[PDB]
mmCIF file of all heavy atoms in Angstrom:
data_model
loop_
_atom_site.group_PDB
_atom_site.id
_atom_site.type_symbol
_atom_site.label_atom_id
_atom_site.label_comp_id
_atom_site.label_asym_id
_atom_site.label_seq_id
_atom_site.Cartn_x
_atom_site.Cartn_y
_atom_site.Cartn_z
ATOM 1 N N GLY A 66 17.865 59.053 155.380
ATOM 2 C CA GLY A 66 18.361 58.241 156.477
ATOM 3 C C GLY A 66 19.728 57.614 156.247
ATOM 4 O O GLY A 66 20.269 56.938 157.126
ATOM 5 N N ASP A 67 20.292 57.826 155.064
ATOM 6 C CA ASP A 67 21.599 57.270 154.756
ATOM 7 C C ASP A 67 22.686 58.280 155.093
ATOM 8 O O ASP A 67 22.743 59.368 154.517
ATOM 9 C CB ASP A 67 21.645 56.851 153.283
ATOM 10 C CG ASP A 67 20.888 55.557 153.035
ATOM 11 O OD1 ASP A 67 20.620 54.845 154.019
ATOM 12 O OD2 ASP A 67 20.563 55.238 151.876
ATOM 13 N N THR A 68 23.545 57.910 156.036
ATOM 14 C CA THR A 68 24.609 58.797 156.483
ATOM 15 C C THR A 68 26.012 58.200 156.416
ATOM 16 O O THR A 68 26.988 58.860 156.776
ATOM 17 C CB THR A 68 24.343 59.259 157.933
ATOM 18 O OG1 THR A 68 24.404 58.130 158.815
ATOM 19 C CG2 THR A 68 22.963 59.900 158.040
ATOM 20 N N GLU A 69 26.108 56.953 155.966
ATOM 21 C CA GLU A 69 27.391 56.258 155.850
ATOM 22 C C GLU A 69 27.738 56.212 154.369
ATOM 23 O O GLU A 69 26.991 55.637 153.575
ATOM 24 C CB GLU A 69 27.275 54.822 156.359
ATOM 25 C CG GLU A 69 26.540 54.645 157.668
ATOM 26 C CD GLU A 69 27.435 54.808 158.867
ATOM 27 O OE1 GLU A 69 28.575 55.291 158.705
ATOM 28 O OE2 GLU A 69 26.993 54.452 159.979
ATOM 29 N N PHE A 70 28.867 56.796 153.993
ATOM 30 C CA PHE A 70 29.239 56.805 152.585
ATOM 31 C C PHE A 70 30.635 56.254 152.334
ATOM 32 O O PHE A 70 31.462 56.191 153.243
ATOM 33 C CB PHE A 70 29.144 58.234 152.036
ATOM 34 C CG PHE A 70 27.883 58.948 152.430
ATOM 35 C CD1 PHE A 70 27.938 60.076 153.246
ATOM 36 C CD2 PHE A 70 26.638 58.486 152.008
ATOM 37 C CE1 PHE A 70 26.781 60.734 153.642
ATOM 38 C CE2 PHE A 70 25.463 59.142 152.400
ATOM 39 C CZ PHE A 70 25.540 60.273 153.223
ATOM 40 N N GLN A 71 30.891 55.843 151.096
ATOM 41 C CA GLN A 71 32.203 55.327 150.747
ATOM 42 C C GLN A 71 32.814 56.037 149.559
ATOM 43 O O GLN A 71 34.034 56.172 149.483
ATOM 44 C CB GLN A 71 32.155 53.816 150.482
ATOM 45 C CG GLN A 71 31.006 53.322 149.622
ATOM 46 C CD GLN A 71 31.051 51.806 149.428
ATOM 47 O OE1 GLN A 71 30.024 51.159 149.209
ATOM 48 N NE2 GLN A 71 32.251 51.239 149.498
ATOM 49 N N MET A 72 31.982 56.518 148.640
ATOM 50 C CA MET A 72 32.515 57.189 147.461
ATOM 51 C C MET A 72 31.574 58.228 146.855
ATOM 52 O O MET A 72 30.354 58.071 146.872
ATOM 53 C CB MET A 72 32.876 56.135 146.407
ATOM 54 C CG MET A 72 33.712 56.631 145.240
ATOM 55 S SD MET A 72 33.962 55.347 143.982
ATOM 56 C CE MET A 72 35.462 54.590 144.587
ATOM 57 N N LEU A 73 32.163 59.294 146.324
ATOM 58 C CA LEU A 73 31.406 60.364 145.679
ATOM 59 C C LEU A 73 32.060 60.738 144.350
ATOM 60 O O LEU A 73 33.245 61.055 144.303
ATOM 61 C CB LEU A 73 31.343 61.610 146.574
ATOM 62 C CG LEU A 73 30.763 62.862 145.900
ATOM 63 C CD1 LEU A 73 29.295 62.645 145.610
ATOM 64 C CD2 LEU A 73 30.956 64.089 146.789
ATOM 65 N N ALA A 74 31.280 60.704 143.273
ATOM 66 C CA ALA A 74 31.794 61.049 141.953
ATOM 67 C C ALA A 74 31.149 62.343 141.483
ATOM 68 O O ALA A 74 29.940 62.550 141.655
ATOM 69 C CB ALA A 74 31.503 59.913 140.955
ATOM 70 N N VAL A 75 31.960 63.207 140.879
ATOM 71 C CA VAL A 75 31.497 64.497 140.382
ATOM 72 C C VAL A 75 31.980 64.690 138.951
ATOM 73 O O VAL A 75 33.130 64.393 138.641
ATOM 74 C CB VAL A 75 32.050 65.639 141.249
ATOM 75 C CG1 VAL A 75 31.334 66.939 140.923
ATOM 76 C CG2 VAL A 75 31.909 65.280 142.711
ATOM 77 N N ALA A 76 31.105 65.197 138.085
ATOM 78 C CA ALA A 76 31.451 65.400 136.683
ATOM 79 C C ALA A 76 30.859 66.676 136.076
ATOM 80 O O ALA A 76 29.719 67.039 136.348
ATOM 81 C CB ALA A 76 30.999 64.180 135.868
ATOM 82 N N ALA A 77 31.655 67.341 135.249
ATOM 83 C CA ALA A 77 31.251 68.557 134.556
ATOM 84 C C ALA A 77 32.070 68.631 133.264
ATOM 85 O O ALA A 77 33.074 67.930 133.115
ATOM 86 C CB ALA A 77 31.508 69.779 135.423
ATOM 87 N N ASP A 78 31.644 69.474 132.336
ATOM 88 C CA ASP A 78 32.331 69.600 131.057
ATOM 89 C C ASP A 78 33.528 70.555 131.100
ATOM 90 O O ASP A 78 33.515 71.607 130.472
ATOM 91 C CB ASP A 78 31.331 70.057 129.989
ATOM 92 C CG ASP A 78 31.879 69.918 128.594
ATOM 93 O OD1 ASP A 78 32.717 69.013 128.388
ATOM 94 O OD2 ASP A 78 31.464 70.691 127.700
ATOM 95 N N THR A 79 34.559 70.171 131.844
ATOM 96 C CA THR A 79 35.766 70.977 131.988
ATOM 97 C C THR A 79 36.968 70.277 131.343
ATOM 98 O O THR A 79 36.956 69.069 131.161
ATOM 99 C CB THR A 79 36.078 71.232 133.479
ATOM 100 O OG1 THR A 79 35.956 70.003 134.206
ATOM 101 C CG2 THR A 79 35.113 72.249 134.065
ATOM 102 N N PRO A 80 38.018 71.037 130.992
ATOM 103 C CA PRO A 80 39.236 70.499 130.365
ATOM 104 C C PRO A 80 39.808 69.310 131.145
ATOM 105 O O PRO A 80 40.170 68.288 130.572
ATOM 106 C CB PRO A 80 40.184 71.701 130.369
ATOM 107 C CG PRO A 80 39.251 72.876 130.270
ATOM 108 C CD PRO A 80 38.152 72.486 131.231
ATOM 109 N N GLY A 81 39.901 69.455 132.459
ATOM 110 C CA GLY A 81 40.406 68.369 133.279
ATOM 111 C C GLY A 81 39.313 67.945 134.241
ATOM 112 O O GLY A 81 38.175 68.374 134.100
ATOM 113 N N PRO A 82 39.617 67.096 135.223
ATOM 114 C CA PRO A 82 38.575 66.681 136.166
ATOM 115 C C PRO A 82 37.967 67.932 136.791
ATOM 116 O O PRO A 82 38.681 68.913 137.033
ATOM 117 C CB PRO A 82 39.348 65.848 137.178
ATOM 118 C CG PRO A 82 40.456 65.233 136.314
ATOM 119 C CD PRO A 82 40.894 66.407 135.492
ATOM 120 N N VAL A 83 36.664 67.912 137.043
ATOM 121 C CA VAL A 83 36.011 69.074 137.625
ATOM 122 C C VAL A 83 36.496 69.275 139.054
ATOM 123 O O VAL A 83 36.759 68.314 139.769
ATOM 124 C CB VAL A 83 34.456 68.929 137.605
ATOM 125 C CG1 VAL A 83 34.010 67.764 138.489
ATOM 126 C CG2 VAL A 83 33.813 70.229 138.067
ATOM 127 N N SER A 84 36.626 70.531 139.460
ATOM 128 C CA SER A 84 37.071 70.862 140.806
ATOM 129 C C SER A 84 35.914 71.334 141.693
ATOM 130 O O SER A 84 35.307 72.367 141.428
ATOM 131 C CB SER A 84 38.129 71.959 140.739
ATOM 132 O OG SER A 84 38.447 72.418 142.034
ATOM 133 N N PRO A 85 35.592 70.576 142.755
ATOM 134 C CA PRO A 85 34.498 70.963 143.654
ATOM 135 C C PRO A 85 34.779 72.343 144.243
ATOM 136 O O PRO A 85 35.926 72.647 144.586
ATOM 137 C CB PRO A 85 34.532 69.878 144.731
ATOM 138 C CG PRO A 85 35.072 68.684 144.005
ATOM 139 C CD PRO A 85 36.181 69.290 143.165
ATOM 140 N N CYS A 86 33.748 73.180 144.363
ATOM 141 C CA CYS A 86 33.956 74.509 144.935
ATOM 142 C C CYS A 86 34.195 74.389 146.444
ATOM 143 O O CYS A 86 33.945 73.341 147.046
ATOM 144 C CB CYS A 86 32.762 75.427 144.655
ATOM 145 S SG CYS A 86 31.306 75.132 145.668
ATOM 146 N N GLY A 87 34.702 75.461 147.043
ATOM 147 C CA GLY A 87 34.982 75.448 148.469
ATOM 148 C C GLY A 87 33.804 75.097 149.357
ATOM 149 O O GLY A 87 33.949 74.346 150.318
ATOM 150 N N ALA A 88 32.632 75.629 149.032
ATOM 151 C CA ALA A 88 31.439 75.374 149.825
ATOM 152 C C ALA A 88 31.083 73.897 149.795
ATOM 153 O O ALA A 88 30.677 73.332 150.803
ATOM 154 C CB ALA A 88 30.260 76.212 149.301
ATOM 155 N N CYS A 89 31.219 73.275 148.630
ATOM 156 C CA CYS A 89 30.911 71.855 148.515
ATOM 157 C C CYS A 89 31.920 71.008 149.283
ATOM 158 O O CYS A 89 31.552 70.018 149.908
ATOM 159 C CB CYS A 89 30.873 71.424 147.050
ATOM 160 S SG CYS A 89 29.288 71.713 146.251
ATOM 161 N N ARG A 90 33.189 71.390 149.234
ATOM 162 C CA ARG A 90 34.202 70.641 149.961
ATOM 163 C C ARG A 90 33.878 70.697 151.460
ATOM 164 O O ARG A 90 34.039 69.713 152.174
ATOM 165 C CB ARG A 90 35.590 71.226 149.693
ATOM 166 C CG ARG A 90 35.959 71.228 148.218
ATOM 167 C CD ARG A 90 37.390 71.660 147.991
ATOM 168 N NE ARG A 90 37.703 71.725 146.567
ATOM 169 C CZ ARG A 90 38.928 71.868 146.070
ATOM 170 N NH1 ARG A 90 39.972 71.953 146.884
ATOM 171 N NH2 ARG A 90 39.110 71.938 144.754
ATOM 172 N N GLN A 91 33.404 71.852 151.920
ATOM 173 C CA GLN A 91 33.047 72.038 153.317
ATOM 174 C C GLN A 91 31.920 71.086 153.713
ATOM 175 O O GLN A 91 31.993 70.427 154.746
ATOM 176 C CB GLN A 91 32.614 73.489 153.558
ATOM 177 C CG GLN A 91 32.322 73.833 155.017
ATOM 178 C CD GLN A 91 33.543 73.685 155.903
ATOM 179 O OE1 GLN A 91 34.605 74.240 155.618
ATOM 180 N NE2 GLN A 91 33.396 72.941 156.991
ATOM 181 N N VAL A 92 30.882 71.018 152.890
ATOM 182 C CA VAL A 92 29.748 70.143 153.165
ATOM 183 C C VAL A 92 30.189 68.686 153.120
ATOM 184 O O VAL A 92 29.704 67.849 153.882
ATOM 185 C CB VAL A 92 28.618 70.390 152.156
ATOM 186 C CG1 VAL A 92 27.472 69.393 152.372
ATOM 187 C CG2 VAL A 92 28.119 71.810 152.318
ATOM 188 N N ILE A 93 31.123 68.389 152.226
ATOM 189 C CA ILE A 93 31.654 67.040 152.101
ATOM 190 C C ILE A 93 32.458 66.665 153.350
ATOM 191 O O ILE A 93 32.364 65.545 153.835
ATOM 192 C CB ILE A 93 32.557 66.925 150.858
ATOM 193 C CG1 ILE A 93 31.696 67.067 149.594
ATOM 194 C CG2 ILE A 93 33.324 65.604 150.883
ATOM 195 C CD1 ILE A 93 32.478 67.167 148.319
ATOM 196 N N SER A 94 33.236 67.604 153.876
ATOM 197 C CA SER A 94 34.048 67.322 155.056
ATOM 198 C C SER A 94 33.194 67.117 156.309
ATOM 199 O O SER A 94 33.619 66.468 157.261
ATOM 200 C CB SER A 94 35.052 68.455 155.296
ATOM 201 O OG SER A 94 34.385 69.636 155.706
ATOM 202 N N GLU A 95 31.987 67.668 156.295
ATOM 203 C CA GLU A 95 31.071 67.553 157.421
ATOM 204 C C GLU A 95 30.244 66.269 157.384
ATOM 205 O O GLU A 95 30.074 65.615 158.408
ATOM 206 C CB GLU A 95 30.138 68.767 157.443
ATOM 207 C CG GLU A 95 28.862 68.619 158.294
ATOM 208 C CD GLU A 95 28.911 69.393 159.613
ATOM 209 O OE1 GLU A 95 29.662 70.389 159.702
ATOM 210 O OE2 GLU A 95 28.181 69.020 160.554
ATOM 211 N N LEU A 96 29.731 65.907 156.211
ATOM 212 C CA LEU A 96 28.886 64.721 156.096
ATOM 213 C C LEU A 96 29.587 63.429 155.707
ATOM 214 O O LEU A 96 28.992 62.357 155.782
ATOM 215 C CB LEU A 96 27.752 64.984 155.110
ATOM 216 C CG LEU A 96 26.826 66.144 155.468
ATOM 217 C CD1 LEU A 96 25.823 66.377 154.347
ATOM 218 C CD2 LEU A 96 26.113 65.828 156.779
ATOM 219 N N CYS A 97 30.845 63.524 155.291
ATOM 220 C CA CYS A 97 31.589 62.334 154.898
ATOM 221 C C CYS A 97 32.746 62.071 155.837
ATOM 222 O O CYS A 97 33.395 63.002 156.313
ATOM 223 C CB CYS A 97 32.138 62.482 153.476
ATOM 224 S SG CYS A 97 30.885 62.580 152.187
ATOM 225 N N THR A 98 33.002 60.798 156.114
ATOM 226 C CA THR A 98 34.128 60.458 156.969
ATOM 227 C C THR A 98 35.367 60.824 156.158
ATOM 228 O O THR A 98 35.308 60.918 154.931
ATOM 229 C CB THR A 98 34.135 58.961 157.331
ATOM 230 O OG1 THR A 98 33.789 58.179 156.181
ATOM 231 C CG2 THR A 98 33.131 58.690 158.442
ATOM 232 N N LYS A 99 36.482 61.046 156.837
ATOM 233 C CA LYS A 99 37.710 61.439 156.161
ATOM 234 C C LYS A 99 38.284 60.418 155.183
ATOM 235 O O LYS A 99 39.186 60.741 154.410
ATOM 236 C CB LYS A 99 38.757 61.813 157.207
ATOM 237 C CG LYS A 99 38.261 62.908 158.138
ATOM 238 C CD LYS A 99 39.317 63.341 159.138
ATOM 239 C CE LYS A 99 38.764 64.416 160.069
ATOM 240 N NZ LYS A 99 39.798 64.900 161.023
ATOM 241 N N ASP A 100 37.750 59.199 155.200
ATOM 242 C CA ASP A 100 38.235 58.142 154.315
ATOM 243 C C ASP A 100 37.454 58.002 153.002
ATOM 244 O O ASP A 100 37.893 57.296 152.090
ATOM 245 C CB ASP A 100 38.218 56.803 155.054
ATOM 246 C CG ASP A 100 36.819 56.395 155.468
ATOM 247 O OD1 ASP A 100 36.145 57.203 156.139
ATOM 248 O OD2 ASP A 100 36.388 55.276 155.119
ATOM 249 N N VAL A 101 36.299 58.658 152.905
ATOM 250 C CA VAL A 101 35.489 58.592 151.687
ATOM 251 C C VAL A 101 36.332 58.995 150.479
ATOM 252 O O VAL A 101 37.137 59.927 150.547
ATOM 253 C CB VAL A 101 34.236 59.517 151.780
ATOM 254 C CG1 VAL A 101 33.462 59.505 150.456
ATOM 255 C CG2 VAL A 101 33.329 59.043 152.911
ATOM 256 N N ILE A 102 36.155 58.279 149.376
ATOM 257 C CA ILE A 102 36.907 58.564 148.164
ATOM 258 C C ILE A 102 36.135 59.512 147.254
ATOM 259 O O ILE A 102 34.959 59.274 146.948
ATOM 260 C CB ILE A 102 37.229 57.258 147.392
ATOM 261 C CG1 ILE A 102 38.191 56.404 148.222
ATOM 262 C CG2 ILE A 102 37.835 57.577 146.028
ATOM 263 C CD1 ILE A 102 38.380 55.000 147.691
ATOM 264 N N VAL A 103 36.795 60.592 146.845
ATOM 265 C CA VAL A 103 36.171 61.562 145.954
ATOM 266 C C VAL A 103 36.772 61.388 144.564
ATOM 267 O O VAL A 103 37.973 61.581 144.365
ATOM 268 C CB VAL A 103 36.401 63.031 146.431
ATOM 269 C CG1 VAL A 103 35.710 64.000 145.472
ATOM 270 C CG2 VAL A 103 35.856 63.223 147.834
ATOM 271 N N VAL A 104 35.922 61.027 143.611
ATOM 272 C CA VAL A 104 36.335 60.798 142.228
ATOM 273 C C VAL A 104 35.900 61.962 141.348
ATOM 274 O O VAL A 104 34.716 62.185 141.141
ATOM 275 C CB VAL A 104 35.700 59.480 141.686
ATOM 276 C CG1 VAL A 104 36.082 59.256 140.234
ATOM 277 C CG2 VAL A 104 36.145 58.305 142.541
ATOM 278 N N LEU A 105 36.867 62.700 140.826
ATOM 279 C CA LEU A 105 36.582 63.844 139.973
ATOM 280 C C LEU A 105 36.831 63.492 138.519
ATOM 281 O O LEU A 105 37.808 62.810 138.199
ATOM 282 C CB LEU A 105 37.455 65.032 140.380
ATOM 283 C CG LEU A 105 37.434 65.386 141.877
ATOM 284 C CD1 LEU A 105 38.369 66.570 142.125
ATOM 285 C CD2 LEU A 105 35.999 65.705 142.340
ATOM 286 N N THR A 106 35.944 63.950 137.637
ATOM 287 C CA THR A 106 36.095 63.674 136.216
ATOM 288 C C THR A 106 35.383 64.707 135.345
ATOM 289 O O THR A 106 34.851 65.696 135.845
ATOM 290 C CB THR A 106 35.565 62.250 135.849
ATOM 291 O OG1 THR A 106 35.936 61.946 134.502
ATOM 292 C CG2 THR A 106 34.046 62.182 135.948
ATOM 293 N N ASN A 107 35.395 64.477 134.035
ATOM 294 C CA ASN A 107 34.737 65.368 133.094
ATOM 295 C C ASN A 107 33.957 64.548 132.073
ATOM 296 O O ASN A 107 33.509 63.446 132.381
ATOM 297 C CB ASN A 107 35.763 66.293 132.407
ATOM 298 C CG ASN A 107 36.858 65.540 131.677
ATOM 299 O OD1 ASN A 107 36.789 64.322 131.499
ATOM 300 N ND2 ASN A 107 37.878 66.277 131.228
ATOM 301 N N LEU A 108 33.776 65.075 130.870
ATOM 302 C CA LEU A 108 33.042 64.339 129.852
ATOM 303 C C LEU A 108 33.971 63.695 128.816
ATOM 304 O O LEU A 108 33.521 63.284 127.747
ATOM 305 C CB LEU A 108 32.039 65.259 129.137
ATOM 306 C CG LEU A 108 31.009 66.066 129.947
ATOM 307 C CD1 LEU A 108 29.917 66.567 128.999
ATOM 308 C CD2 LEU A 108 30.389 65.229 131.038
ATOM 309 N N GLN A 109 35.260 63.598 129.137
ATOM 310 C CA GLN A 109 36.223 63.010 128.211
ATOM 311 C C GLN A 109 37.183 61.996 128.820
ATOM 312 O O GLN A 109 38.253 61.748 128.275
ATOM 313 C CB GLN A 109 37.011 64.113 127.498
ATOM 314 C CG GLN A 109 36.200 64.828 126.434
ATOM 315 C CD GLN A 109 36.981 65.910 125.713
ATOM 316 O OE1 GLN A 109 38.045 65.655 125.152
ATOM 317 N NE2 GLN A 109 36.444 67.130 125.715
#
């Protein structure tokens, strides 16, 4: 029932911040308002 979001963080063991795949970005653009903050990171 939660459809209002403000921030999304994603993490994976990559050299730099992890990069969301195209399909995920698509789902993010549909369920998140254009102002939601996407925080990308890794394990370092």
Side-chain angles (χ1 to χ4, degrees):
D67 284 343
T68 65
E69 315 273 13
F70 314 115
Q71 45 180 153
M72 192 185 270
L73 171 67
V75 192
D78 193 29
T79 46
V83 64
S84 172
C86 76
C89 275
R90 302 187 183 191
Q91 185 63 53
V92 175
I93 292 172
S94 69
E95 163 105 25
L96 300 175
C97 295
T98 41
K99 304 183 181 182
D100 62 306
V101 176
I102 294 169
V103 181
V104 178
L105 309 179
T106 190
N107 58 10
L108 306 196
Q109 286 181 56

